[PDB]
Amino acid sequence: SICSTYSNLYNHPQLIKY
Amino acid sequence: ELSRVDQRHRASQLRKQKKEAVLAEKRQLGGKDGPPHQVLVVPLHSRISLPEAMQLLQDGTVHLNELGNTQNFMLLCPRLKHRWFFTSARPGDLHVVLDMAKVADTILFLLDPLEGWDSTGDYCLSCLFAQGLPTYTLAVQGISGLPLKKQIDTRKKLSKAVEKRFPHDKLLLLDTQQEAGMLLRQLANQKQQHLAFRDRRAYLFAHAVDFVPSEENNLVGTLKISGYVRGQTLNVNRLLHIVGYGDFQMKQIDAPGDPFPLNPKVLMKADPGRQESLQAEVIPDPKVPKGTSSYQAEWIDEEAEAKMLEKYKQERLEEMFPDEVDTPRDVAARIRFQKYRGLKSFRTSPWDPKENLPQDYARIFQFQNFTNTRKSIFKEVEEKEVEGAEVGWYVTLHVSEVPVSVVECFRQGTPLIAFSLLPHEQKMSVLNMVVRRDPGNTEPVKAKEELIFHCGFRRFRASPLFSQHTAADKHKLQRFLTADMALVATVYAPITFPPASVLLFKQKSNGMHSLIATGHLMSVDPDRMVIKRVVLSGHPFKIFTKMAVVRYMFFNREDVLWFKPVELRTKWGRRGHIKEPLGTHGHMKCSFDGKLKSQDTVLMNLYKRVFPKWTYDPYVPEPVPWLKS
Amino acid sequence: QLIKNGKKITAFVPNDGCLNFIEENDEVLVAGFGRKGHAVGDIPGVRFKVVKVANVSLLALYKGKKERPR
Amino acid sequence: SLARAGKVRGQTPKVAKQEKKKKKTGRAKRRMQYNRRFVNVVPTFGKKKGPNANS
RNA sequence: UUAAAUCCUUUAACGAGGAUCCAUUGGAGGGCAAGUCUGGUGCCAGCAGCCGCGGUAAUUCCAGCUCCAAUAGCGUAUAUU
RNA sequence: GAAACCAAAGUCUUUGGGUUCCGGGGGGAGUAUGGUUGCAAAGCUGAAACUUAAAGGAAUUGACGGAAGGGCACCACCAGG
Numbered sequence A: 001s002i003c004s005t006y007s008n009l010y011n012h013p014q015l016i017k018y
Numbered sequence B: 001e002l003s004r005v006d007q008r009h010r011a012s013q014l015r016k017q018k019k020e021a022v023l024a025e026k027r028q029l030g031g032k033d034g035p036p037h038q039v040l041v042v043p044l045h046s047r048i049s050l051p052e053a054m055q056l057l058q059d060g061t062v063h064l065n066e067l068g069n070t071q072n073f074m075l076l077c078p079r080l081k082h083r084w085f086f087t088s089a090r091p092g093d094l095h096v097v098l099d100m101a102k103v104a105d106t107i108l109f110l111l112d113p114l115e116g117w118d119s120t121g122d123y124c125l126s127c128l129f130a131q132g133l134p135t136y137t138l139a140v141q142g143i144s145g146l147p148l149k150k151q152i153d154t155r156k157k158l159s160k161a162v163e164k165r166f167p168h169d170k171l172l173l174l175d176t177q178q179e180a181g182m183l184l185r186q187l188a189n190q191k192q193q194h195l196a197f198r199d200r201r202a203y204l205f206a207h208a209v210d211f212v213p214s215e216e217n218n219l220v221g222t223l224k225i226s227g228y229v230r231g232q233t234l235n236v237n238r239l240l241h242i243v244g245y246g247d248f249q250m251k252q253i254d255a256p257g258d259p260f261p262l263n264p265k266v267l268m269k270a271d272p273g274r275q276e277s278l279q280a281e282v283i284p285d286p287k288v289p290k291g292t293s294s295y296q297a298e299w300i301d302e303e304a305e306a307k308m309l310e311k312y313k314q315e316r317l318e319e320m321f322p323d324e325v326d327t328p329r330d331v332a333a334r335i336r337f338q339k340y341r342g343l344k345s346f347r348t349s350p351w352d353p354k355e356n357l358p359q360d361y362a363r364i365f366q367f368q369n370f371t372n373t374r375k376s377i378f379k380e381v382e383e384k385e386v387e388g389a390e391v392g393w394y395v396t397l398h399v400s401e402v403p404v405s406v407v408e409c410f411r412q413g414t415p416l417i418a419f420s421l422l423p424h425e426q427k428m429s430v431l432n433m434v435v436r437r438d439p440g441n442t443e444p445v446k447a448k449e450e451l452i453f454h455c456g457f458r459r460f461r462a463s464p465l466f467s468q469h470t471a472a473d474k475h476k477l478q479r480f481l482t483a484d485m486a487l488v489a490t491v492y493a494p495i496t497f498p499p500a501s502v503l504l505f506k507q508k509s510n511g512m513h514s515l516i517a518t519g520h521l522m523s524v525d526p527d528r529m530v531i532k533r534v535v536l537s538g539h540p541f542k543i544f545t546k547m548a549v550v551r552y553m554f555f556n557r558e559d560v561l562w563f564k565p566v567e568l569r570t571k572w573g574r575r576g577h578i579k580e581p582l583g584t585h586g587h588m589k590c591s592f593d594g595k596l597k598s599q600d601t602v603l604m605n606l607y608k609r610v611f612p613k614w615t616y617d618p619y620v621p622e623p624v625p626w627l628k629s
Numbered sequence C: 001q002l003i004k005n006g007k008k009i010t011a012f013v014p015n016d017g018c019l020n021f022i023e024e025n026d027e028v029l030v031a032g033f034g035r036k037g038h039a040v041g042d043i044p045g046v047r048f049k050v051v052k053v054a055n056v057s058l059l060a061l062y063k064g065k066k067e068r069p070r
Numbered sequence D: 001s002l003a004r005a006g007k008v009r010g011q012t013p014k015v016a017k018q019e020k021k022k023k024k025t026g027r028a029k030r031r032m033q034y035n036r037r038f039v040n041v042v043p044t045f046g047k048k049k050g051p052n053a054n055s
Numbered sequence E: 001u002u003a004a005a006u007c008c009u010u011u012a013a014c015g016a017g018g019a020u021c022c023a024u025u026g027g028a029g030g031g032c033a034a035g036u037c038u039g040g041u042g043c044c045a046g047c048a049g050c051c052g053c054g055g056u057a058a059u060u061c062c063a064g065c066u067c068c069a070a071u072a073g074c075g076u077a078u079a080u081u
Numbered sequence F: 001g002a003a004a005c006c007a008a009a010g011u012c013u014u015u016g017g018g019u020u021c022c023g024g025g026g027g028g029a030g031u032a033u034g035g036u037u038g039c040a041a042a043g044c045u046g047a048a049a050c051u052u053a054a055a056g057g058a059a060u061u062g063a064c065g066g067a068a069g070g071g072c073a074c075c076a077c078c079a080g081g
Helices: B004-026 B050-058 B094-100 B119-131 B148-162 B177-188 B196-200 B302-320 B370-382 B404-412 B558-562 C058-062 D007-011 D027-037
Strands: A014-016 B037-043 B061-064 B073-077 B082-088 B106-111 B135-140 B171-173 B202-215 B220-229 B240-242 B246-248 B250-255 B266-270 B365-367 B394-403 B417-420 B428-437 B451-455 B459-463 B466-468 B474-478 B486-494 B501-507 B513-521 B529-543 B547-551 B568-570 B575-581 B588-592 B602-609 B613-617 C028-032 C048-053
Touching: B037 B050, B037 B094, B037 B119, B037 B177, B050 B073, B050 B082, B050 B177, B082 B177, B094 B119, B119 B501, B119 B513, B135 B177, B148 B171, B171 B177, B202 B394, B202 B404, B220 B404, B240 B394, B246 B394, B365 B428, B394 B404, B428 B451, B428 B501, B451 B486, B451 B513, B459 B486, B486 B513, B486 B613, B558 B575, B568 B588, C048 C058
Parallel strands: A014 B365, B037 B082, B037 B106, B106 B135, B135 B171, B474 B529
Antiparallel strands: B061 B073, B073 B082, B202 B220, B202 B417, B220 B394, B240 B246, B240 B417, B250 B266, B250 B394, B428 B486, B428 B513, B451 B459, B451 B501, B459 B613, B466 B474, B466 B486, B501 B513, B529 B547, B529 B602, B547 B588, B568 B575, B568 B602, B575 B588, C028 C048
16 A cells, blocks of 8 residues: 555557467 | 789779679669659749749750749750759758658759858758758859959858868859759769668659549548659558658559650559558556544645747856755655655666556567568668669559548648658657757757658657667656767657658747757667656764764655665765664665765655657648748 | 678677667777777777767767767 | 666757956966966965966 | 969058957876866776776866966877887 | 705806707686597697686794693592592
């Protein structure tokens, strides 16, 4: 509650494969 | 190496290989097989009258084309065994000269004998220098209309004037047709300066443009742009970008008769529906008593000028103090800086590159490995041959959907230059450029201010982000574009494979484009973290040994508790940490490594990640000719 | 990589911010650094320094007397 | 990691050069150097002061 | 003047008050001549032929002022004495 | 003579009795290669790229001794309160 956060992993760009 | 005769044999072998490479490179241009040698003529001074220079330079055979305003021709001579296509452009008219300077193989500058050039000539020359210089040649006009005693001094004064931009280049005269023949001989035999961006794409200059409307009420139709392929082999399946109007797919290529051969109807390809590249700019898929208190309940016109002046004072304040922000006492600091955190070190402290991403990142494309993909695509460009039209062929492109206004522009006099793209060049992502500020303009430029980008044959409006050009993972946001640094501009744009010349213009007033920044394109990635810093300052007003009581950094008691974990630093080199808040106001006890001076200030750095604003639009207003105030 | 023999060298770019005037695949004039093929000072294994970038001097770029083409 | 380029030069505030009277050149400058070092000499007990000595 | 010129020389007329008809290139710890000046940076950027300087009072970095050397010239790389 | 020292390591800037071998900052390295000798092991001859601001020789003091001897102290002990 001072310098703590959840920050979930969401809405990444679609990556172009190699 | 030993054995003198064998050393000479080795030298002869290297001579033969290098000479074979030289002759292979030189024969591709202005000949029976290659494309015409394209020359763009720029008269740098307003006293230079372009038409008599073009008429003297006009006479082999001449085939004159006609446009709305500009007048260009095509020259054909078997004495030099060489084929020319001459064009002319007025400096200041940045649209035309900058847009067809990226197709000409040689730029011919014309010079005033008395003065070097105008300010407009200097502006156009700066744009040409930053956009990419082809092979250039300098010529002068009014030398022979002067006596000899003034002639020698005039040439010496010109030589003094030119060295500041062109250090060691010979000046040729255009006074007599014999001098004109000498100048064509000089242009026919040069060392060619090769631009990489031209050589990796497949570009074409439109010699004749025809239009057939699909529906006149729809104001769209099939365009037939005919000219010589000059870059790589032109394949139909790749998309075609017209430099002023965007990128879109093309329907058919045919090869009509080359109208002007050096020495004097069938369709080549239609596009398969499966092998065609798709028009995809972005991703398609998105029990308390009555009167007691809590203390005992726990017991139980001029507005624009004003904006310019406040911009000036903001730029001056942000130069004396890097990212210093006064904390508001009306709202809490932990609410106004809710998204801000503290880094122990800007270098070593971790930051997740995918921690909190905006909804705009769900609309762009990323590269799994951009370097390997770029190298692979360039290897299929160089080492592999496609079934398209070879270079130097006069072909006609049937492109599918284009507005009528383009045709109107082609009747105005503005040239059309169309280039076919690489794979993965229509899709949009986060472009990062490195630019430095031009000395001509000194207007302050905010980070998210709208600018006009010339980024590798494209022109578009965008709102960038300026960052430190640093090799680390985090980069500090620059709130202003500084005059001397090299900065990174971050935008949303369709992706380009480097190298690419980059120009940044500002729409000043009355349709005037002012060049503010010049540079090139760095690697494309959206995972490049841009970090905005906010610096909060407090005054240590009760100093004891190695710990102090500091005020004015906060104004609540729980703001001190919220930003307790962030380490404080000091303008005089001390490092400390918040120990306790005492007052209901933002007074706090802070420990430090040493003892503080009375003249000292404590300060705390807070960090957030910032993303650019999606203000991309390919339409760019046509500039008026440039002039000085 | 030197043009005339194809050998690869490392050259030091002296002043601050002067590496930003250099891009990849650029034409660069290089001289020795002063000790005749011997490494100088802090830098391990550098005998050379960049004199000119794209046929304009790094001194004129640093002092802002001239502009660089590309 | 690290490797900033032109950090301090881009950090330092730009102070403009003041407009001053031009210096004499040639024989006049040598005359002024001679008259300052050998003509209007001030006697000193130990001579511990330089020409650019400040404080 | 000269083949004809140009230049030099000779000459009418115009052409000088410091915002000009404005002199640069390197340097200021020692070697090695000349600042413990001020501001900024903070083992970073960089300087430094060598010794070294820079990790918060930097005589060495980046600037301003001042000063020093040669001066229509002065740096740097390399071969050589 | 740099000195420790040396009747030679003296008769050397007041420098020439005759003559042989042999060194030229520290490393790479007495290594690679070639030649030659040897049954072999190896011997003799013998580099370069590259790296380094030192490496070394004589002397001169003595922080510190986990070096040794002595002395003193109920803010040390022994016998105790």
